Design a protein around this ligand. Structure first.
Ligand code: ATP
Ligand code: ATP
Ligand code: ATP
Ligand code: ATP
Ligand code: ATP
Ligand code: ATP
Lengths: 244, 244, 244, 244, 244, 244
């Protein structure tokens, strides 16, 4: 469909090359351009970023840091990325971009407030959500679908980086994995498909939020999706299809 | 002297190798061991870490982010590093380690409260300060000297990497530069020596907080310092000396 | 198993008769006694209550109140019940009972803080959690399992009122519904069983939290469960069984 | 007089029938209509509701909860009622309706701020105050008169149920009790009349806030009052009169 | 009678001479000594100070500052005095003295929390309450009685300067005015006696708090009162007496 | 030169005569007029006041209050003065004047937020900063320069009372001391000139903020300075001059 309000979910990994780590101005420029391409059509955007380029559980395990404790750390990463992204975004747009946090940091970002968030979006601002949900045991996926629904979003675009959609089985291997053009919710859980949190998926299904999994790394594809093109995978309550 | 209370100032750069970036478990293990070695003498320790291994102004300039905005981003880094550090320290100690923030994040760290901080230290806890000062235009040095004094610290140990103390002119060229055994405040400013912030220097001087600049990368040296040994450089209101 | 730490989840409905509504001192006395029966064995308890006896979606629909808005209201109900329950509990015990909120109300209840919560429990206090998760789109079930895991609980006891366990199909009808002695996670989702949130169930499964669904209305049964007796249904990763 | 700004004080009991308890959509519809009827004249309205339809001291006594503790519980009720009310009002109006709390709950309601409250009212919003005063030992009356004055209100309309105004001696026996058309402050206290708190009364008197006690259950009467009509009782520093 | 717990109400004017203004260390020393005399008997003390030696409505009027605004300024005065007083008290006692505010300033004083205040008192600390009630339109009298009741105080000692009690009619004038040994509440309001806020009087009368009005400026007298002596005036529900 | 944006640093002592203490409405009127004279040219003004007319370390020492504690008291002084000043300013201007605190007091003043402050200033408001920096060990000078830079101020006007500028050596004594027309930063520190904090000086020197030291007590002079005139002393990175 032609969406008017959208929620883009970005992995923290997308902001960094893979090499050393952190940020990579070539990657931040790509991200910014892809984002501005949508807003330029007057679509209202909310962005939820992960903190993967800063902090990983790989280290929490190493020092046996309590899971709730490792999540708090990783959450701060998301706020660092949100703040960065805003810098990059402001440089290229003249639109207002607001960073809202689930852990009010104030004088760093605005404490997150729903109706305020809706308000901004309505006023045509770009809003960025940091610190996800504020809760533990959860991935970037869940909070992001939760905010999408809270913000009366039309769709959630879940940006991937090199994987062009959702496949039957991991193509990084199997001669023949096929990619879904369409994918049912219940069908994803049934065939235990491993694309996004189950909890996120369920919520999205419960509220009828559609999701698009696609290649963020490929220029233009997020615009084509918003423009109505069928690129990548669409997760719906429609009945499953499959590229040909 | 034999100190009873100390504030160690660690750069974020110390928590990472240089290569890629972030954290380096070999480095975090060294840091923990060096800190434990001091507490093991029942010396009360406070730690102030920088956020350099996460965020650098090298970027802010790239995207022209406001100096005050870059500082807030870099500040969250200090809190990420504080939370890590704590994790590592807990793994190896039985002592209580408390992270206090100047930007109360709560349910992530304790909001900083002076007399609570003092109190902990008095109860033999290891306390870590994140978010520095909360203020802008300032480096890690300044807040660290400010918290040192606030905590009735006996000295501030400013841990350096690779560099053994304070020289006449940086050994990074001046072949025959010499290292000070002792360094007067007023003299450091006079001969415009660039070791730590002028502002931090001034404060320490005004409140008579002594400073030790030494090689943290060298096992033992922080203990020898606390044990009364003369290694690295001592910044005092005594009168300048010089290794031989 | 003989649990040492437990999380009891109580529906707000349990505090009221059904008639008019609110509280019912006969019901609050029952609740208190059932709770004290467990702690009297030195088991450490956390309680999560629903706000059903105060607020229902039946009215939100009636006035088309936004779902996120109706949830906030219902959340305040949970804090009213937590505070009440504490009153009733204090009257009958000499143990310390703490109410902790996910929306720090202060000077009404203590802002919820994990390690503090763990601490209390360790010190043998009875802790009550109000305001659930602080998030929308969620039922009392989910936050309660989340806090159970956060609090390193051994099991979650999900108290029912007239339904003695989990059945094949609703017995309020079908001549032959059988009750499970044991119930697999995956098995509950597979056969789309409608006992507790899927999201709560998944989390519990992911973290290995066991759950017991039973008759709170029947005196003694929560003690028998903690004492190791097989009464009601046990939701495990064991393989499904069935009463005979 | 023809008022430009008013503060209506509603008991929680008005939001419920008496029967069971809670809310009664027929009652919430009446309340909304009566409030709209006044704003429809471009009079600026603030509302203070009680929490009686949720919590009563009848219980606190039963379980001997501290008076200060019972008051906090009852206070949360006022905020639940404020949130409901707002929902109902939004459904029927296009005007902006704001809920401000004396216990900043945020992302549930706006923390109360005086000049913001005034400002709203000035911008023609309908504002609702929940959590009364935040203080104990006090009834709904007092804070409502305090917020009335704080808001530069022209009058306070104290909506009663079933009772048409203030009588000589409650018509609940005294057959020939008579209703005051006008009632002096000092006289209400002198002849110890029990209509509203002495403290609220005193304050109103000190700041010259006029009060109207009337039958809210009677359609129209709140408008007739604002329109200058003499219905119900007017509490003034004029000199006492009496219906005929 | 002998009281175990007591609230001392001190006006800001007592901390200063009258001359210029602010603080007078001779006066501060008197205040400290009188306070310690009472605690030295292991009576538990709470203190409420006014902000009069710093700010008075005399200006507010001059520049027409909103009464609510003037009070907010006046309130900051009480906190300043609390903090001073604490300094003074600390210098002379070994006891712990805690300053608690009604406007949580944190890292300046502790946010006021009831059960914490009670606890402190129970642990033999000296507690000082600053920022009164947080509310406008009210004097020091009211909040101080409110805090007395909240703290389960046995009596409220209202220290006056110059006047040894409550007289029939002010004695500058009334050459044969007489001082009450005992004063009924209802009588004070009846004969409209202007000694302390009506609102504060009514509260104390409703909860049975006894009040003592006496000459703070006279060494010993506050101890005499606590020792059971009959000096100054005692406001009770007993029946009015009169010195002879 | 002509400045568009300016920070005025006022000592607390200027609001009072010297005699007794507190506020002097003749002095407050002078201050208001001098401030308005500048804004009347549509120059944007921020103001930083000291708390000296209320509290001084003269006591702190007397009763040995911890330096950090004394400062916290001193800081409450600045907020009181801010609030007063605002009252005064409001009475004479139609312009909006906002008080922002570094210790969010809310419903007393607005919590300080940078971009909000900048915005206000941009919208032509007058902004007052209270509670300085929030930090200890520092004077009014430092925070005021820090806020100047944060606010993108063009200059910092440091109003002095009695002394028309910066002299070679203090003129009570130095009968032939001379006043600088211009003063280099590095020179002020070199010749250890004691006019304003070194720390404040260094900051301003690092960010290029120009400072003006002049006689506030002399009508007109602050306008003359802003009008491009050369009155008082100008601290720059130009090269030192000297009146003739
Ligand atoms: N930490 C923060 N907490 C709260 N608000 C913040 C914070 N940081 C920035 N702000 C915001 O406060 C400012 C204005 O508040 P507000 O949203 O009411 O603006 P507005 O008047 O509605 O819109 P506009 O900017 O177009 O004038 C903006 O600069 C915005 O960035
Ligand atoms: N955000 C926070 N705010 C306040 N307290 C916190 C926060 N995070 C952790 N805490 C702390 O609260 C708890 C209790 O505080 P405190 O240090 O005074 O304990 P205690 O009762 O004196 O005894 P103990 O030394 O055994 O902890 C600690 O266990 C610690 O985790
Ligand atoms: N709103 C609140 N916010 C924070 N703490 C609160 C609040 N309400 C009550 N408290 C608590 O503060 C008090 C003591 O704090 P703390 O947990 O450090 O106690 P403790 O010294 O560790 O234990 P104990 O009560 O056994 O002496 C208790 O009365 C407890 O109820
Ligand atoms: N907890 C809260 N804290 C602060 N603001 C809140 C909170 N909840 C809601 N708000 C509000 O923040 C928003 C913006 O504030 P404000 O009323 O000043 O809007 P505005 O920019 O001046 O214009 P408008 O009248 O269109 O809303 C509102 O839409 C309102 O929902
Ligand atoms: N703004 C604040 N918020 C919370 N607590 C505060 C604040 N300011 C001060 N405190 C307090 O926290 C500190 C520790 O609290 P607490 O009195 O419960 O300590 P304790 O470990 O139980 O033992 P004790 O105080 O007797 O030495 C106190 O010294 C006091 O300074
Ligand atoms: N403690 C506080 N926290 C937040 N905002 C506050 C606080 N105290 C005061 N305010 C402010 O909130 C009010 C509304 O904010 P704002 O200035 O952005 O209004 P506005 O609707 O955009 O228009 P305008 O102020 O020009 O009339 C101000 O009048 C000011 O009083």
């Amino acid at each position: 469909r032609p969406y008017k309000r959208v929620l883009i979910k970005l992995s923290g990994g997308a902001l960094a090359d893979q090499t050393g780590n952190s940020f990579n101005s070539k990657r931040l420029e790509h991200i910014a351009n892809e984002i501005l391409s949508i807003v330029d059509l007057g679509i209202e955007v909310s962005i939820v970023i992960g903190g993967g380029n800063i902090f990983r559980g790989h280290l929490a395990e190493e020092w046996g840091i309590d899971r709730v404790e490792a999540d708090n750390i990783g959450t701060l990463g998301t706020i660092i990325n949100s703040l960065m992204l805003r810098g990059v975004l402001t440089s290229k747009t003249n639109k207002e971009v607001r960073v809202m946090t689930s852990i009010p940091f104030n004088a760093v970002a605005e404490p997150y407030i729903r109706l305020r968030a809706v308000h901004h979006l309505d006023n045509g601002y770009i809003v960025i959500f940091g610190g996800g949900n504020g809760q533990p045991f959860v991935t970037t996926d869940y909070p992001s679908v939760q905010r999408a629904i809270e913000m009366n979003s039309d769709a959630i675009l879940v940006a991937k980086q090199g994987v062009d959609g959702v496949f039957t089985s991991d193509p990084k291997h199997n001669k023949s994995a096929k990619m879904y053009r369409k994918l049912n919710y219940n069908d994803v859980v049934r065939q235990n498909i491993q694309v996004m949190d189950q909890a996120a998926l369920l919520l999205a299904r419960d509220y009828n939020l559609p999701a698009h999994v696609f290649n963020f790394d490929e220029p233009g594809v997020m615009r084509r999706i918003c423009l109505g093109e069928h690129v990548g995978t669409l997760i719906n309550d429609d009945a499953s299809l499959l590229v040909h």
